[model samples]
Target: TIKEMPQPKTFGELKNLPLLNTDKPVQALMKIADELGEIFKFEAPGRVTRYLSSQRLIKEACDESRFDKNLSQALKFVRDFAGDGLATSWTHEKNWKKAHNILLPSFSQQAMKGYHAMMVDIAVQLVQKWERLNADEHIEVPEDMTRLTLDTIGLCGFNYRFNSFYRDQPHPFITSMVRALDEAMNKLRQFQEDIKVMNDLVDKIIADRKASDDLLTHMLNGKDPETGEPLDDENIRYQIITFLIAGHETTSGLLSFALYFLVKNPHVLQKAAEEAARVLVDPVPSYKQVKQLKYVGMVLNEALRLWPTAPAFSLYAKEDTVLGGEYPLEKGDELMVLIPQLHRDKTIWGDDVEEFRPERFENPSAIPQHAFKPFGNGQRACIGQQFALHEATLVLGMMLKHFDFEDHTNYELDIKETLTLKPEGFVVKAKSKKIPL
Candidate 1:
């Protein structure tokens, strides 16, 4: 049997009773945080679930010595569907290290530079699509962002192309995969059908590339990348599945929300376009040029704070240590960081927390560490963040440089949650512009 830790008896004294729906779970939990301030509890099957939003308690959880990533049942659902890929794996597990090391260098500073060409190629495809649209043509921003990301990850991570931009519907694998991710909605009886579609497609690609034996090949092998260790013959599919899902989902959400805000905050959009036009001299920005664009990044930072793509992650105690002083004493008692709420801490962010203002993060270092964990917490923080950081930067700068936007529906930001959150029913219109050398 695996050495899993037992649940703690010392749950926090506060409790908020609700119907406890796992669907749209973060917002459900968010309601309780409003009712009972920073820390509170709700009893779930055989155990009490916890959520913490204050800077004080989150700061306590961020201390790596006391806490580490915990797979709460939501994450556990992901693990059961796709074995232990990096996103869902216990940090120290053998497969975790094997996959992490194998994949790490591919996302290195140098590696991202090499991936820049492919990134721009996809970005250009998006630009071309927008180029054909008139200024008044309304675009549902997230749909195209999803197409771009899925195609980008499909090409950059593997040599395969989902070719999402050319299609009227999403790739079937994506359809099935998304259907499976409806685990957020807690649907499973039809799960086997959905799971079969993705598995069959992934396996076909794996076998074809193995036969093709070309330079475009991703590892897609039975053995680990280094030290000659082997992976579970069965478990290899999970590694690929994790990369596909984790690689694109949150970044798509981030881009959609960020673009939506730009429409609402027109001044922010104009300044960002000016910055993009000034710094992005290359038709496709150089790696150096991408880093040089600062305002674009501040916009991204603010986007994540207001609507953090992956809303909450859990950290469990490492020892029988007290939390935020006298809270608890147990190794496995977990604290969930509901980051959208954490970023909105009224005390830390002053009043106007809901408003879109990139200046709040102008001096990010001055902000407390736990106050802004968009990627995730320490150690187990997202490895792809560095990749996505530049990925979004380049795309935003390029879009701003070549396209101007206006509001479509004046729709408010209503969050639609799956494993990640995106602006639902948000729409914007774009117009193509002349680009200069």
Candidate 2:
């Protein structure tokens, strides 16, 4: 009898790390998720990474008393670039705590309100850039989306500007950083020299004369309001890398996926454009104007449900605990909650689990909590969740108002699982709807 944990009965179906399998592991995991049921053990080479695939099990195992965020080997590679910064730092580390406390208010609701004009500024610049391009040319969706997000994070976080859209190449710093993440997902390996190019920029930002309300300004001048302490330069550097690392591609993928879904599904597209027309009576959106685009937000939520930008995050048990009152789990056993499958749970989401139904998220309140955790879980959750959503909504509002998106490729949605998920080889061309609402 199998005494430890239940695994799918198949023998040769990817016995290695479900996360690191070079061959379409996401699809493999989706297949396994079908056969293995809930609370199954995923053997990741030498260790066991328990995959909690159900909503209830995900919620129970995520209790702070029992579980804490654990770095995957992939995340450990991130430390090569991000160090003990916000995204890659362990829960127990003092760096994450101090940085989280210090940077907390900067990413808060008020900060979001403050960042709105800057977001609109960059977003308009993007729309104009697209306007300048030849209408028939196939736009590079993911790369250009990252360029927008990269510039936004730059101006908002460091008050620095790569001016990526204007440039022929991405800034050397950002280019290396993307490579750093690609390396992080290379099974993934670490990049030795490209790592230097990233910190080189961070060092200049730290060394610079420095900011107005950008995040770097906060760290450079802001205090730990509770501790009455300030972050030293090294920690500030950590956060800068963490912000760019954590901030840019994740949202870029979000925008890209949202665009892909909107184009592919006609009703969602027409309804979204109609909502945009209804909401943006004034061309420039204020906080109130952007917030009213409920259907646009719903479309984003649905996109995340299908392709959570952050995908699976690792967890470690705090005590020697049994999951579901049966599987013997060691105190230090690493676990992964499969969010991709969890979001698509047929039991909770019903028969239309695979469909891109934005209305399903209309009362997101009614959805199970941990089941839709596109932003990981607990204190380690994405610091910029509100910022990402609001920025995406603002951009989507403008996009839907101004353009009709056409699928350049009748793109098969392929998974490119790096540290996060991006729809591989997906591209779209946008034509000006010219409603000017």
Candidate 3:
């Protein structure tokens, strides 16, 4: 199989290579990812590793020995946009480790318990808003979901309130954050000084905070274990901004795509809604109770498989090494892994890889390590993995009970990739659950 794979030629060849369609970038890349096979090279000024659709090689490259966490030049815009936060702090392992350790407790089950009620209340608010809309009215999925997630993160991460749903004009914080993502995806230049808008907003929240226990408070008051020094105001700002931006957008994308698939597959939606109606009799299920909604969990997993939030990320090699025991790599070589392609690998996922089937996760252990990595793989995987899952499960479950969605626009996923994969302007029709008031 390795012997039969096509090798990369020159930069010009890769650059000039004809794609089946350029409009669908992710789909086009999937073709290249599969056609090129496991390891291929591209001379984008210099050599870069394009590891197409291979779990084994990705595992080796991501292994602690062969690599430390490496954010590639593709993410240069994100690093510069958000400044020196976790996304950019891979080079500074010591600072990163201290921050990571201090923040770990904030995302724990205990902390989630604290945030759970707030998450439910927020989801309820969104449902109530949907209650006001007439039946079959088109709801902008991305916009509404983004607002809900923004509000959720505001209370959960910072104990502040954006009241995003109640507001007509976008908050300055949301405006700047959206622009940062837009600029990253569409433009090549550095972010302008608009980040100060976010800084000012965060400063206002910090100045107004009571001496309470929340993630923001903990990070603000807690001392660094490595040096016993507290994070400076500037660094704390970076952390808060990172949490706000990274925390909300990806989850919003998840919900948007989940709705997309649910509406498209009526049977799947019917199964999920029935499960939600049965399990969420309390209007809001507790974190533990939401976990019992097994069908909802499986649907989320399958949705993530089809259209992951942080799709197609890169890892870099620290030293000269071999990947998958065959592909040689030099120090500083960048390994780009196509998650969209890998998720749809026919060999791994079987004949119906493209189909929307939640049954694949019924026996999750049957799925191999690195095989289902929507959250990512190994050491540098998402710290808020469980946190995101809990929030999505609760919100989606609660939503299913209160409403049934239809495809008003018959919208297809016009995915726009920024710092995350987002469905651009996907809309849906909604009607309150027939059993409800």
Residue 263 CA error for candidate 1 (Å)? 0.9
Over 28-54, each residue of candidate 1 has an lDDT whose tens digit, in order, gives 767767777778765654555568888
| Stretch of 10 with least lDDT, candidate 2 | 9-18
Worst 10 residues of 1 by lDDT: 1-10
| Tens digit per residue, CA lDDT, model 2, 262-325 | 8889888999999988989887888999899999999999999988888788899888887766
Local lDDT at 30 for model 2: 68
Worst 10 residues of 3 by lDDT: 14-23
lDDT of 2 at 242: 85
List TM-score per model, in order. 0.91, 0.93, 0.91
Candidate 3's C-alpha runs over 4 A off are: 1-25, 187-190, 210-212, 434-437
Top TM-score model: 2
* lDDT score, candidate 1, position 424: 82
Segments in model 2 whose C-alpha atoms lie over 4 Å from true places: 1-4, 8-20, 188-190, 435-437
Best prediction by lDDT: 2
When sorted by TM-score, best at the front, the candidate numbers are: 2, 3, 1
TM-score of 1: 0.91
lDDT of 3 by residue, 124-233 (tens): 78888888887546688888888889899898888889998888767778888777766665542225656768778878778778543778977788777777876676
On the 0 to 100 scale, the lDDT of residue 227 in model 3 is 77
